[PDB]
């Protein structure tokens, strides 16, 4: 397991700087690929990750002298841009090593920002952060898709103030009076990297990352969005919403008109009415089709993976299942049956019940259908599998009972669910004997559920809402967030609205000669903080 | 009066908030499964009123969930009346109280000032 | 934007008294009305508004000398 050891990789494990020291003047190797299985990624395995390097292994054992030393060596000086088997440098690294603790945080913060000015002072002309490993990711779009909300928070407000050397950092200011300071945030990454940049691997997590609600919070992301958001997308969601009711509308319109003769197709007459009716069909199935395709297009794109489509996505599964079932009516149509208005009924439910979908942007109200959704998923599993089973019970006690019209295990079923709705009898028969038994049967029923469970399931209820008071905002901001990338990336018109406040210069002078232009967003703020 | 004035402006606070918030999901749900059951049943109701008027009677307890027998489909339409039930009666009236509860916890002191 | 600009309120955005003692021996007036549209009101866009008096800046930026400074000049002193 222990393969590919160096006595360097010992030192630097027991934190020894002298014999790191003897080591280097000994003349041992830089570039010690130790790939051993105990410290190799995939943790499952007790283990701790190095990746092939002793500056990582340094680094993230928190030993700045070992760093600076292995970056200063006279026999041979080492290189932080070194890459591992799976092409992950030092900063790959110490994101892996994060977890979003307090202490971690602040050691990872530190360690970071001190190995990349270092980078940064040994070959000003080199890039360090922008390399990728074989995945195609930076630090920060590692960061970033793993949750690693710490190191994320510190990546995005880097901060520096030394002559020559700002040219790292990414959150500027332009002006500063007295309250008044007007701050520049570097959005390059933010909205595309031409592969994959921190909104989109954020937005469409796996859902496996414990804290992906939360990374919006994030200052100039959030910002971002909010301003993306009243800038053009506001206005082409509600036209959205507004040709979705249109839809609906024509759909009911067409469905309910329906003719009631045997056998269709039916045949158009002459009337102008037959001339709406046929239109409105038509306007019906060119929808469910339109919403088939986006489905798919869904699918294709993103790719989820027999986990997320459980957990994730009902929107774009549920618009899917209507746009299945409004095809099924058209097949059933065209087949001469007339089960078709079957298939045609389920889409309208659902038609109506999905336009919940857009209450996203209304925030008030989408707080609320957030509530509903995680109701419908917790609380009537929780509830269901109780009640179904007391009601099955006591259905075929009685039914076992009763035997001389009812005498049926569907009826009675039934007419055991009427005492939740508030209209059971407690005589809805009289034929039998034991008429004690088939009391009592009926009213410890009727305690054990209308009088019990359903009090629970309000108690309950009542404990989750408390719960999921903030869960919810985060929950919303989320959607409200994918809405926005998913309005911005096909847009069907070949426009970029996208960009940020112009191409404004970083310093205009590089460590090199040559200009450089950030594209970044201005977040004014006054304080009495910095007097 | 005190103790009645801050209940009258709890009242008028929750009618504002909650008969918004509870009343837009709720006509969504009762208005598509209204359309849908009339729908389906056409051969007395036929009638988007009528059938508007019997699914609301789930909501105050008085459904009856064989209001007509004049279709066929009749596991599409037992399908519906209980997907309406479920989805109405014993979540969304149950979901109102729960809210209605943590609005309270959260109205306790704006009230005294408000009735100031 | 920045119309009616003195020197004064230069300083005193600075916080430096000292440019103020000389503006002030230099013979700098009092009242500057100083419409700049980046010192009226409604901060929505960036401004800090004081109206048309640096004493206003002065008592606004929490420097107690120089309000005492202005209202107690030998050139000429302030009105409240
Ligand atoms: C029998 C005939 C009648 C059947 C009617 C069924 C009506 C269903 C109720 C109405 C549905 C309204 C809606 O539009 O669906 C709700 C979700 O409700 C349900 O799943 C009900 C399942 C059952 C909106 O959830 P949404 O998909 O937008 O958010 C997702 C995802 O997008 C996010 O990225 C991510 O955060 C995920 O955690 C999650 O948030």
């Not at 054992?61 to 060596?73: E, G, R």
């Not at 006279?74 to 603790?101: K, M, Y």
């Not at 990349?116 to 360090?128: R, V």
């Not at 005589?427 to 629970?456: C, G, H, Q, R, S």
Request: proline share 3%; hydrophobic share 45%.
């Amino acid at each position: 397991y222990y393969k590919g050891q160096t006595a360097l990789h010992i030192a630097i494990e027991r934190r020894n700087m002298t014999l790191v020291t003897l080591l280097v003047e000994n003349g041992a190797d830089v570039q010690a690929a130790a790939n051993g299985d105990f410290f190799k990624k995939t943790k499952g395995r007790p283990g701790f990750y190095f990746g092939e390097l002793p500056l990582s292994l340094a680094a993230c054992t928190n030993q700045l002298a070992i760093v600076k030393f292995l970056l200063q060596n006279s026999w041979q000086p080492a290189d932080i841009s070194a890459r591992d088997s799976v092409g992950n440098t030092v900063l790959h690294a110490l994101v892996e090593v994060a977890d979003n603790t307090v202490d971690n945080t602040k050691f990872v913060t530190s360690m970071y920002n001190e190995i990349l000015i270092l980078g940064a002072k040994l070959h000003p002309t080199l890039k360090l952060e922008e390399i990728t490993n074989r995945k195609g990711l930076t630090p920060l779009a590692l960061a970033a898709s793993s949750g690693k909300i710490g190191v994320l928070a510190y990546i995005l407000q880097r901060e520096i103030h030394e002559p020559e050397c700002r040219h790292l950092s990414r959150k500027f200011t332009e002006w500063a009076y007295g309250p008044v300071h007007s701050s520049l945030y570097d959005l390059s990454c933010i909205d595309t990297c031409e592969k994959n940049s921190v909104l989109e691997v954020i937005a469409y997590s796996s859902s496996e990352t414990p804290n992906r609600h939360d990374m919006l919070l994030v200052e100039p992301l959030n910002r971002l969005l909010q301003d993306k958001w009243d800038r053009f997308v506001k206005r082409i969601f509600y036209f959205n919403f507004f040709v979705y009711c249109l839809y609906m509308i024509i759909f009911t319109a067409a469905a309910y008109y329906r003719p009631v003769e045997g056998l269709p197709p039916y045949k158009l007459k002459n009337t102008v009415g037959d001339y709406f009716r046929v239109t409105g069909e038509i306007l019906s199935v060119s929808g469910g089709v339109y919403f088939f395709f986006r489905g798919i297009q869904y699918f294709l794109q993103r790719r989820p993976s027999l986990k997320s489509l459980f957990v994730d996505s009902y929107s774009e599964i549920l618009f899917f299942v209507q746009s299945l079932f409004m095809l099924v009516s058209v097949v059933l149509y065209f087949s001469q049956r007339k089960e078709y208005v079957a298939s045609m009924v389920f889409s309208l439910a659902m038609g109506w019940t999905n336009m919940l979908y857009y209450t996203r942007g209304f925030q008030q109200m989408g707080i609320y259908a957030v509530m509903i959704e995680k109701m419908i998923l917790r609380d009537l599993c929780r509830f269901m599998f109780v009640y179904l089973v007391f009601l099955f019970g006591f259905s075929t006690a009685v039914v076992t009972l009763i035997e001389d019209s009812y005498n049926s295990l569907y009826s009675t079923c039934l007419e055991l669910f009427k005492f939740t709705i508030g209209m059971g009898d407690l005589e809805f028969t009289e034929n039998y004997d034991f008429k004690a038994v088939f009391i009592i049967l009926l009213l410890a029923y009727v305690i054990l559920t209308y009088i019990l469970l359903l009090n629970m399931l309000i108690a309950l209820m009542g404990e989750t809402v408390n719960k999921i008071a903030q869960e919810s905002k985060n929950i919303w901001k989320l959607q409200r967030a994918i809405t926005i990338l998913d309005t911005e990336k096909s847009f069907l018109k070949c426009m970029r609205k996208a960009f940020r406040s112009g191409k404004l210069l970083q310093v205009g002078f590089t460590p090199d000669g040559k200009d450089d232009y950030r594209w970044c967003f201005r977040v004014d703020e006054v304080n009495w903080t910095t007097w």
